[model samples]
Target: PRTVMVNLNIHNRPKRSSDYYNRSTSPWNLHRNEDPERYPSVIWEAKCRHLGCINADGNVDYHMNSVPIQQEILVLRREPPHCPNSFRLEKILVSVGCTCVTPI
Candidate 1:
């Protein structure tokens, strides 16, 4: 098993709950196949960390952005994507606090 860390930066000014983007199917995945020689691990784990202007409940703190919001996620690699050796999404895990701001 291999562990990898990734960070995503999203810029958005969400006025309300509906204004938020759906991250349930985020395309962010590991690219170990790109360098198989360097990353030979078959099973990969990614720690997806997102940071932006939002609240602990996963909502935009203010209309024009008040404070930075942060979210941590755990992703597991189950299989490969359509593209040979490409990365694919399998299981996703997020904090309970995120349930208030974003749906799992």
Candidate 2:
């Protein structure tokens, strides 16, 4: 019934080698010796893969990465550990098509 405090960060990088290093964020304590049961609410967020620096006109667009708001989500969870802050979660997973989506 209590809110377990957990830190999270949004990694806006899309690189194969960035996954391993993008595990933790600032203001959050070290995960060493951390107990999963303590913190269950996970705010998993990220940018779309197609948010690249390209445009139809071929001009350098700073905000050109905006491609029709690719915020389409195929799966949504809100129960037990999967649910946002329902309780303590022993195990949880957040995936977006394992084929093309890499770790990071």
Q: What is the TM-score of each candidate against the true structure?
A: 0.18, 0.19
User: Model 1: which residue pairs collide?
Assistant: 52-69
TM-score of 1: 0.18
Tens-place lDDT digits, model 2, residues 24-63: 1101111233334344223344333333343356443454
Q: lDDT per residue, candidate 1, 1-104, as tens digits?
A: 66544443456663566313345222122323233322233333332233223455656433332222234543333344334333444433332222222322
Instruction: Flag regions of model 1 displaced more than 4 Å.
Output: 1-34, 39-50, 61-104
